[PDB]
Write a protein that holds these residues in place. Sequence first.
Motif, PDB file in Angstrom:
ATOM      1  N   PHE A   1      11.948   1.886  -4.083  1.00 13.83           N
ATOM      2  CA  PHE A   1      10.601   1.693  -4.599  1.00 13.83           C
ATOM      3  C   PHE A   1      10.554   0.534  -5.583  1.00 13.83           C
ATOM      4  CE2 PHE A   1      10.864   6.479  -4.090  1.00 13.83           C
ATOM      5  CZ  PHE A   1      10.419   6.451  -2.788  1.00 13.83           C
ATOM      6  N   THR A   2      11.196  -0.577  -5.237  1.00 12.81           N
ATOM      7  CA  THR A   2      10.998  -1.793  -6.015  1.00 12.81           C
ATOM      8  C   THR A   2       9.558  -2.266  -5.853  1.00 12.81           C
ATOM      9  OG1 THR A   2      11.654  -3.263  -4.201  1.00 12.81           O
ATOM     10  CG2 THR A   2      13.390  -2.522  -5.712  1.00 12.81           C
ATOM     11  N   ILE A   3       9.078  -3.009  -6.840  1.00  9.83           N
ATOM     12  CA  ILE A   3       7.773  -3.644  -6.753  1.00  9.83           C
ATOM     13  C   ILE A   3       7.681  -4.453  -5.461  1.00  9.83           C
ATOM     14  CG2 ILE A   3       6.393  -5.529  -7.704  1.00  9.83           C
ATOM     15  CD1 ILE A   3       7.448  -4.501 -10.512  1.00  9.83           C
ATOM     16  N   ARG A   4       8.728  -5.212  -5.169  1.00  5.94           N
ATOM     17  CA  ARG A   4       8.744  -6.046  -3.981  1.00  5.94           C
ATOM     18  C   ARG A   4       8.597  -5.230  -2.699  1.00  5.94           C
ATOM     19  NH1 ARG A   4      10.046 -11.195  -3.033  1.00  5.94           N
ATOM     20  NH2 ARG A   4      10.546 -11.687  -0.859  1.00  5.94           N
ATOM     21  N   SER A   5       9.362  -4.153  -2.567  1.00  6.52           N
ATOM     22  CA  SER A   5       9.282  -3.314  -1.380  1.00  6.52           C
ATOM     23  C   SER A   5       7.908  -2.664  -1.245  1.00  6.52           C
ATOM     24  CB  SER A   5      10.362  -2.234  -1.406  1.00  6.52           C
ATOM     25  OG  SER A   5      10.259  -1.406  -0.262  1.00  6.52           O
ATOM     26  N   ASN A   6       7.331  -2.275  -2.376  1.00  8.26           N
ATOM     27  CA  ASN A   6       6.015  -1.645  -2.390  1.00  8.26           C
ATOM     28  C   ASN A   6       4.877  -2.566  -1.940  1.00  8.26           C
ATOM     29  OD1 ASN A   6       6.924   0.892  -3.107  1.00  8.26           O
ATOM     30  ND2 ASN A   6       6.418   0.686  -5.280  1.00  8.26           N
ATOM     31  N   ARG A   7       5.105  -3.876  -1.949  1.00  8.78           N
ATOM     32  CA  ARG A   7       4.072  -4.799  -1.476  1.00  8.78           C
ATOM     33  C   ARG A   7       3.740  -4.596  -0.001  1.00  8.78           C
ATOM     34  NH1 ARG A   7       7.209  -9.588  -4.373  1.00  8.78           N
ATOM     35  NH2 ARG A   7       6.452  -9.258  -6.519  1.00  8.78           N
ATOM     36  N   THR A   8       4.697  -4.118   0.784  1.00  5.40           N
ATOM     37  CA  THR A   8       4.457  -3.851   2.201  1.00  5.40           C
ATOM     38  C   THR A   8       3.251  -2.928   2.387  1.00  5.40           C
ATOM     39  OG1 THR A   8       6.785  -4.187   2.802  1.00  5.40           O
ATOM     40  CG2 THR A   8       5.445  -2.896   4.336  1.00  5.40           C
ATOM     41  N   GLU A   9       3.137  -1.931   1.517  1.00  5.18           N
ATOM     42  CA  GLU A   9       2.031  -0.984   1.570  1.00  5.18           C
ATOM     43  C   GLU A   9       0.684  -1.659   1.277  1.00  5.18           C
ATOM     44  OE1 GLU A   9       2.773   2.921   0.181  1.00  5.18           O
ATOM     45  OE2 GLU A   9       0.790   3.205  -0.707  1.00  5.18           O
ATOM     46  N   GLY A  10       0.669  -2.588   0.324  1.00  5.55           N
ATOM     47  CA  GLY A  10      -0.538  -3.350   0.038  1.00  5.55           C
ATOM     48  C   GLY A  10      -0.933  -4.285   1.171  1.00  5.55           C
ATOM     49  N   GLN A  11       0.053  -4.980   1.730  1.00  8.40           N
ATOM     50  CA  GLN A  11      -0.171  -5.842   2.884  1.00  8.40           C
ATOM     51  C   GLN A  11      -0.766  -5.042   4.042  1.00  8.40           C
ATOM     52  OE1 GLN A  11       3.823  -7.100   3.499  1.00  8.40           O
ATOM     53  NE2 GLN A  11       3.976  -8.019   1.454  1.00  8.40           N
TER      54      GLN A  11
ATOM     55  N   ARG B   1       2.677  -3.326 -12.578  1.00  8.91           N
ATOM     56  CA  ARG B   1       3.752  -4.175 -13.092  1.00  8.91           C
ATOM     57  C   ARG B   1       3.962  -5.460 -12.288  1.00  8.91           C
ATOM     58  NH1 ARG B   1       8.746  -0.977 -12.350  1.00  8.91           N
ATOM     59  NH2 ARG B   1       7.515  -0.160 -10.594  1.00  8.91           N
ATOM     60  N   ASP B   2       3.349  -5.562 -11.108  1.00 11.92           N
ATOM     61  CA  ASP B   2       3.543  -6.731 -10.246  1.00 11.92           C
ATOM     62  C   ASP B   2       2.732  -7.927 -10.722  1.00 11.92           C
ATOM     63  OD1 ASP B   2       4.225  -8.498  -8.265  1.00 11.92           O
ATOM     64  OD2 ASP B   2       3.409  -7.307  -6.606  1.00 11.92           O
ATOM     65  N   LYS B   3       3.229  -8.594 -11.754  1.00 10.96           N
ATOM     66  CA  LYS B   3       2.549  -9.757 -12.297  1.00 10.96           C
ATOM     67  C   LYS B   3       2.682 -10.953 -11.364  1.00 10.96           C
ATOM     68  N   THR B   4       3.799 -11.029 -10.653  1.00  6.76           N
ATOM     69  CA  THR B   4       4.054 -12.172  -9.784  1.00  6.76           C
ATOM     70  C   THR B   4       3.043 -12.273  -8.646  1.00  6.76           C
ATOM     71  OG1 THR B   4       6.412 -12.144 -10.304  1.00  6.76           O
ATOM     72  CG2 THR B   4       5.737 -13.342  -8.322  1.00  6.76           C
TER      73      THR B   4
ATOM     74  N   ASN C   1       3.113 -16.849   0.528  1.00 10.83           N
ATOM     75  CA  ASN C   1       4.041 -16.456   1.576  1.00 10.83           C
ATOM     76  C   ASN C   1       5.077 -15.448   1.101  1.00 10.83           C
ATOM     77  OD1 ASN C   1       2.730 -18.039   3.474  1.00 10.83           O
ATOM     78  ND2 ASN C   1       4.162 -19.760   3.294  1.00 10.83           N
ATOM     79  N   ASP C   2       5.632 -15.660  -0.086  1.00  8.29           N
ATOM     80  CA  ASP C   2       6.630 -14.720  -0.569  1.00  8.29           C
ATOM     81  C   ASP C   2       6.028 -13.348  -0.871  1.00  8.29           C
ATOM     82  OD1 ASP C   2       9.505 -14.331  -1.256  1.00  8.29           O
ATOM     83  OD2 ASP C   2       8.652 -13.807  -3.197  1.00  8.29           O
ATOM     84  N   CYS C   3       4.802 -13.339  -1.382  1.00  8.78           N
ATOM     85  CA  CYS C   3       4.108 -12.099  -1.701  1.00  8.78           C
ATOM     86  C   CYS C   3       3.743 -11.288  -0.460  1.00  8.78           C
ATOM     87  CB  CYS C   3       2.852 -12.416  -2.499  1.00  8.78           C
ATOM     88  SG  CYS C   3       3.176 -12.983  -4.183  1.00  8.78           S
ATOM     89  N   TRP C   4       3.694 -11.957   0.690  1.00 10.09           N
ATOM     90  CA  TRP C   4       3.409 -11.308   1.964  1.00 10.09           C
ATOM     91  C   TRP C   4       4.664 -10.937   2.761  1.00 10.09           C
ATOM     92  CZ3 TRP C   4      -0.958  -9.356   4.382  1.00 10.09           C
ATOM     93  CH2 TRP C   4      -2.121  -9.420   3.604  1.00 10.09           C
ATOM     94  N   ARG C   5       5.834 -11.123   2.158  1.00 12.45           N
ATOM     95  CA  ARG C   5       7.082 -10.681   2.774  1.00 12.45           C
ATOM     96  C   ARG C   5       7.362  -9.227   2.450  1.00 12.45           C
ATOM     97  NH1 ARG C   5       9.826 -16.230   0.769  1.00 12.45           N
ATOM     98  NH2 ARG C   5       9.550 -17.451   2.696  1.00 12.45           N
TER      99      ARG C   5
ATOM    100  N   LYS D   1      -3.104  -9.199  -7.209  1.00 10.26           N
ATOM    101  CA  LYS D   1      -4.008  -8.829  -6.123  1.00 10.26           C
ATOM    102  C   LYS D   1      -3.662  -9.572  -4.849  1.00 10.26           C
ATOM    103  CE  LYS D   1      -7.899  -8.009  -9.280  1.00 10.26           C
ATOM    104  NZ  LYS D   1      -9.246  -8.501  -9.685  1.00 10.26           N
ATOM    105  N   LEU D   2      -3.532  -8.830  -3.760  1.00 14.87           N
ATOM    106  CA  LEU D   2      -3.369  -9.420  -2.446  1.00 14.87           C
ATOM    107  C   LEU D   2      -4.736  -9.515  -1.783  1.00 14.87           C
ATOM    108  CD1 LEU D   2      -0.247  -7.356  -1.303  1.00 14.87           C
ATOM    109  CD2 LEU D   2      -0.280  -9.547  -2.493  1.00 14.87           C
ATOM    110  N   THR D   3      -4.961 -10.557  -0.988  1.00 17.10           N
ATOM    111  CA  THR D   3      -6.249 -10.725  -0.322  1.00 17.10           C
ATOM    112  C   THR D   3      -6.066 -11.087   1.140  1.00 17.10           C
ATOM    113  OG1 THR D   3      -6.439 -13.065  -0.966  1.00 17.10           O
ATOM    114  CG2 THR D   3      -7.442 -11.447  -2.440  1.00 17.10           C
ATOM    115  N   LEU D   4      -7.084 -10.777   1.935  1.00 23.07           N
ATOM    116  CA  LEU D   4      -7.095 -11.109   3.349  1.00 23.07           C
ATOM    117  C   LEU D   4      -8.547 -11.248   3.775  1.00 23.07           C
ATOM    118  CD1 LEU D   4      -5.428 -11.428   6.011  1.00 23.07           C
ATOM    119  CD2 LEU D   4      -5.761  -8.969   6.342  1.00 23.07           C
ATOM    120  N   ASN D   5      -8.889 -12.311   4.497  1.00 23.26           N
ATOM    121  CA  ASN D   5     -10.266 -12.464   4.962  1.00 23.26           C
ATOM    122  C   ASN D   5     -10.407 -12.404   6.480  1.00 23.26           C
ATOM    123  OD1 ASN D   5      -9.710 -15.039   5.969  1.00 23.26           O
ATOM    124  ND2 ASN D   5     -10.866 -16.128   4.388  1.00 23.26           N
ATOM    125  N   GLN D   6     -11.624 -12.638   6.967  1.00 23.57           N
ATOM    126  CA  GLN D   6     -11.915 -12.463   8.389  1.00 23.57           C
ATOM    127  C   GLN D   6     -11.258 -13.519   9.274  1.00 23.57           C
ATOM    128  OE1 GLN D   6     -14.278 -13.835   6.313  1.00 23.57           O
ATOM    129  NE2 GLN D   6     -14.242 -15.811   7.363  1.00 23.57           N
TER     130      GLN D   6
END
Length: 108
Positions: free
Chosen positions: A1-11, A76-79, A104-108, A82-87
């Motif tokens: 449950f690193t911040i980085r691994s948790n980004r997958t859920e946001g993506q 805690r994910d300052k780097t 790109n790194d934030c979407w890995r 907010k993730l965004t995605l449009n149409q």
Amino acid sequence: FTIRSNRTEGQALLSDAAARQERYYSQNPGVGYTKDVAKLGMSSANSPNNLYNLTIATPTSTTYTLTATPINSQTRDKTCGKLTLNQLGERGAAGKTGNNSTVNDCWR
């Protein structure tokens, strides 16, 4: 449950919601995209483990920008923030958009 691994859920929250937007639009001719997650067939705007919250803007009836805002421990994910995605499928992170190293790194 690193911040980085948790980004997958946001993506995934965003990608899944974008797919739902396209279905909603097709299922409801003449209506346009929606800001209501219930209309996308979602029972919550929170990701399953309560790491991101989905909000939706529809600047016009034929466009949308989806935002996944970190909540709870993920704040805690300052780097990446907010993730965004449009149409158009344009991805964003940390207030930036497009094909660059930060996004790109934030979407890995």
